[PDB]
Curated annotation (Swiss-Prot), chains E, G, J:
Its EC number is 1.16.-.-. The gene is dps. Its main location: cytoplasm. Keywords: Cytoplasm, Iron, Iron storage, Metal-binding, Oxidoreductase. Protects DNA from oxidative damage by sequestering intracellular Fe(2+) ion and storing it in the form of Fe(3+) oxyhydroxide mineral. One hydrogen peroxide oxidizes two Fe(2+) ions, which prevents hydroxyl radical production by the Fenton reaction. The keyword DNA repair does not apply. This is DNA protection during starvation protein. The record marks W52, E55, V84, Q85, H163, H167, E170 as: Involved in iron translocation. GO terms for cellular component: cytoplasm.
């Protein structure tokens, strides 16, 4: 093999020694796994959402999945740039994720969104810790990328929170 | 000062004597104040809307706010073109507005929309009267601008009316 | 749960009874799993590719991954439309996939591309058989969707074949 | 009411307790009020600017106003996301603003721009302090959002500085 | 009549049966629109002159503005001429004809400073703006709501450019004696 | 039913009582029926046009049909906004139309275009009268919408007139 | 075999292992696609000729149409040639080869009137359309659904252009003896 | 006056002495006058064209007029750049033009186009002479500009020649 | 026949007598034949290119073919404009071409590109001679067109030269 | 002071009152940014050299990459220079000055093979990347969060291009001895 | 080394012998050095411009710098294409430039622009000489490229001349 899973070489081009690079990679690889499980669960909810609000939700969840995909790509490319091996196979990504993943049954949209919000929250807390890590290691490019991703993730988590809030235009009358 | 609040000079370039220009300015400045309070309340509702329909509403209210902003800009530039001084500070705009403005608490989305619909209705009635005024003064450019704005305002007010209507895809079952 | 994994309800809107739909869904879900494994492995190779041709390959592989992701989305949405439950979690996708997936080490580019070429071939052969199945059930929309995906998959597979062919501009002199 | 002005609930989605969120919200709402006063005063100057440079200034000021409006929208949405109530009505915005606002007369362009420059400086100094507050609370998304706005605000402030500098192409000969 | 070489004779107005506008009504509108057309094309040509020739400390901003103003005038002229033709008239066409039929004042061929140039343009705009207002009322009074609408759409663009010129001429500036 | 055909409720949002709205709706619904007949006949002529000029005419007629469809949409939406019920089914549209409609045979292009020209004229004359009705009721938005449509209708009608005029580049020599 | 100068010999077909298409199946498809390619490139070149040379009262509309039709034919040729290559064959390439392998009738180098020119094109389209229909059935019968799909996507574009030519030739016109 | 019609100052920026510049200016001004007469007559023909081919011609003539306008602008700007005064007023442009201009009657389209073809030919011949003049003076930018314009004018003239050619799809049968 | 292959009539619109036009036409037709052979061979190489660099080459060769097609179109249109008949059928174009064309076997990419380079060089030399011819006849539009085409052909020929140069990133190590 | 010909003297730093940045703080930031600017403009010019001169089997892909990399460097230089000026300093300007003030190693004027060329570029990137990291900490420590933000936005683009070069130099390839 | 600074090999692809190519290369390299000094000084003036007209100038100078950069790129690529070595390092470009470069102090804008005007004039004169050189060598692509660049440089030089002219809208009154 050209590279072995779990090894971190650092980078001469980026002037990152293997020691610092390994600490960053460890964090970024853990995030990658969670963000890809998030991407797949968002896809699931995008595909399956039904009912009175479904089309708006389908569009939102599709866009949220594309965001998660792009964050994943950034995390993975950074892992590779730092001389690591990004988690790749679906079985690896899920095994390495710490978040909870739905079983293969389809739940109602409130349950589904609440499950996703939990995932977001875990990723958000982790990402805040990892940005601090990167900045303390002097890896400002990593810290900056993590913040650029964090803002997009927090926006989506916030949207979910709002979808679940106890207000509606619907009245008893209209029923 | 270069110009004093409340004074109207007219315009030699536009061949509008100060007498006619003052009548138009008086109407346009009153509209400007109401339309900017409308813009700020729409922004408020855009920011705060929550629940099952929130994202569609957030997008609608954002777009409705941008429309109000553009109408305000047009009214203000016309005031200035006619040799007047458009109402400018936030405190002035609200003091000069005749419409009701919500206090700083956040109301549920039905209440919030109903409050906005009332504002629209007042602006719509006023704008119809002001277009007639402008045309009777021979200020056809003003009358035309007012109509171009009126159609956009009536479209948004109509959308609000529809959001509040007593129909829904939701059934008791789905609850 | 709202739907149980493996169940196929058909669709009243699409006038497809569950019996007929089930045959199509079993094919499309098998394809979905293989295509998402392909997507993840193309992403791996996109992230990790190095050497004299790497940027052209990085771009190709990224585009190929996007094509796979879009085909997956189409298959999953068709499953759902026919009253099925698309495979969703990463562990399910890999478990339900028939194709071979690389272990987590990184291999040289010729090895990597050859591995991908084998996955394409598997999917292309299956898709051919599934288009016939769909047309024999009278599900012309599914058969049409399969063909539109098949052509894009064959194009990428054919590109891989060309990348591995025994020609080059490079000479011993230039070495 | 659904939310009472001044209250800060935090956010479960964003994993920010109310205590922590409240510190951030008090800063962001203070900034919001100053930025919306800035927006309205830039609009004033956009509408009223006259003379030899007026079209270039009209365009600059209009773009600057759009930047302010976007920064305001970001601040307000962040307040709401953290479980706060963004200042909304014009009278509230001006009352909660710390910066100085022109009276309703129109001043010459150098005076007007100098007044705006002072508002920018106030906001820029506050935003610097608020980014540090956010980062010290571990609210990296807020701190990142503050910096993205800060750079655009500094750019406009710097433009104003250049407009007021003691150089020109004009000569006594050309007069 | 069947042997005339011309397809239409300048100054005649036939109305339109497609548009259900009789020739009597159409003739009143065409008289107005053709007069406007001549003035707008003189404006266009003078804006072009000023666009080409403007120099000095603000010249690039003015060059861009004047070019955009000329394009606007060209577009309004096109609309007026096409409306004359739609109503069964003959739009004034040759440059000599357009200037002969124009009521506005044209600069001679020497080049003047920018303040003079813009003030001369401002006077043209004003004359056109007053006439357009009159012609909009004429069209609405005859029930030709499409012409009235078209005139208003043009008027707002011409007023905006007239207003910009008024602003360029105003007595304010960033320049100070100390910068000089 | 939610609304009964022929009923006009007015609108609270738009501050139009039913009495006033009804006058406008009766005009707009009559126009709607004629414009949709026009749309269908332009489509017919678009589909069937043949000969030396057919492609230019096919494109013109298709664009003209799109214009008619947009005018119809505007009229129908205004009817609904004023609390009316827009004519909807094809049989209703043709029954409520005052203009003449071709039988199902295909006629030569001059005949076809002349038939369309007559429909345009009818609609143009009515629209002129309806804009006056709207303005006399103080419904300036409706009157403005009517004028914006009228100009596009007159443009297409005028094109037809030119297509039928007695000139051509063709000579006996070229024959 | 290891010492041949050519990388591939014209007329041989190797199939594809990437595409899981054996050479026997691939050869039947390639025979069909190459024949189509030759006819489509002759069509392309004749459409170009007519685009360049068209004159008279309708010439600009026809010039645009014929240019668009040629671009369509060029695109279909590209797809057919790339499919031949994907299936392990050698697409016909040189102009002499393309015309030699084409079954359709080509105009000689003189320029004919537009009605003649379009009628000659119409005959080419028709021949290609009938063959493409046959080849789509051939591909689907061999299980080469991607080739069949590609052929259908091409066929609809070629049919649309053939139909336009049929319309241009139809016996109607706005022109009247009185306009003449 | 800043500059007198007929003065040619040359340019220090462009390193063109007044003697060389004057030769170019006289040529360019001659061309400007002709090109603007061409513009006005193309407009005339665009406005008035009627009959079986009118829409295609209306479009072509509008585009040809656009091209003539852009050539005139380039000619005039170059005059000014070389320190001369471009011909400006409509009366001056027609007086200074050497080509024949139609009287104010409207002619049939064949006559109209033949008149335009003659103007084009005169301009084309002159432009070829002026390009040679420019190159002989070492004014390669002028020469290049003249050629860039020439190619566009030749293309339009060529189109007119083709419209007038003795071919058509029309048959006596169709008549 | 309307025109006989080999007749050159010149143009009254372009004020080009048949004697001058014929000299240009013969030159342009020669170039047209060569450029279309070049197009067909670039297509061939685009379709067939294989190996480590094939995708970059496939793209380059497709673009080079596009450029050759556009040059041929300009050449042919100019022939026609000058009153000649452009070479049209595939057999005629190859017969009239002076450059060498590959037989129908597929060669390796270095051989293929070297064959193309030779065609380019022949065309480039001819085009330079033809530009001088055109300018000497006073046909400046032809000369300008030829140069606009020449620069694009030279750029493509230059690229081929670079692809064939004796450098690479590949090392014996990588092999 | 009132009689100096220069408007600003190279090496002086005045801070900004608009930006509420005193001269002492601003001077530390400007020293850093100007040093970066010089290195980034040397990088830009060497990327341009390599873009122009690259040849061989991968040259077109590298030509495109190097052109894009140079545009990135140009953009970063622009941002650094404009920030120096905003903080009341004088950005290094002339080519001689930029290279004199640059700490990185510049190739001599001969042309080297692509592997050598890219390795020389890689060394420049690395030096700039290490300094930029230092300067981001400097800016944040002084409370100049906008400069820090700007530096990070630049750093990520420069790191991406440095990483691409690292990949181009890696010891893998599709090429095989059999293809040779 | 692959090529030595100062070697000129010509090109077999472009059919340009080293003797002819060397004459062009020397000319183009001279121009490249001057154009890059011009670029750097335009950048300088873009960065530093202050005062009443600064934003318009900042924009103009940025665009002029862009144009100079693109001309330099074309010059350098042509050098390389002809088998020479383009001047590359900043020190080499300034050493090889014949134009005067400002010292590192910042001058007022009139002085700055006058310095730039002088550089433009020197380049314009040289470029005219080089175009003639190229055409005399039969290198028509070089000649054409030089003219395409010349026209853009002349336009920018002309703008600078206009900015420096003795006119303004400013009056003593406004002061
Ligand atoms: Fe990626
Ligand atoms: Fe505005
Ligand atoms: Fe989807
Ligand atoms: Fe399709
Ligand atoms: Fe918002
Ligand atoms: Fe950012
Ligand atoms: Fe027009
Ligand atoms: Fe609609
Ligand atoms: Fe409008
Ligand atoms: Fe292709
Ligand atoms: Fe211009
Ligand atoms: Fe050009
Ligand atoms: Fe063409
Ligand atoms: Fe810049
Ligand atoms: Fe380049
Ligand atoms: Mg690596
Ligand atoms: Mg004013
Ligand atoms: Mg479902
Ligand atoms: Mg909330
Ligand atoms: Mg007519
Ligand atoms: Mg309703
Ligand atoms: Mg192959
Ligand atoms: Mg001048
Ligand atoms: Mg001809
Ligand atoms: Mg400064
Ligand atoms: Mg070389
Ligand atoms: Na390679
Ligand atoms: Na000024
Ligand atoms: Na015809």
């Amino acid at each position: 093999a050209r590279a072995t899973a779990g090894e971190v070489e650092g980078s001469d081009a980026l002037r990152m020694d293997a020691d610092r690079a390994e600490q960053c990679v460890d964090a970024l690889n853990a995030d990658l796994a969670n963000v890809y499980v998030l991407y797949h669960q968002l896809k699931k909810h995008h595909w399956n959402v039904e009912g009175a609000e479904f089309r708006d939700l389908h569009l939102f969840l599709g866009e949220a999945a594309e965001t998660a995909e792009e964050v994943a790509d950034e995390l993975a490319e950074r892992v590779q740039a730092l001389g690591g091996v990004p988690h790749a196979s679906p079985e690896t990504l899920q095994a390495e994720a710490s978040v909870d993943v739905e079983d293969e049954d389809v739940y109602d949209i409130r349950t589904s969104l609440a499950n996703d919000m939990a995932i977001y929250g875990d990723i958000i807390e982790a990402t805040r810790e990892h940005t601090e890590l990167a900045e303390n290691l002097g890896d400002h490019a990593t810290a900056h990328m993590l913040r650029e991703g964090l803002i997009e993730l927090e926006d989506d988590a916030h949207h979910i929170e709002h979808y679940l809030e106890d207000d509606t235009l619907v009245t008893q009358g209209a029923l």
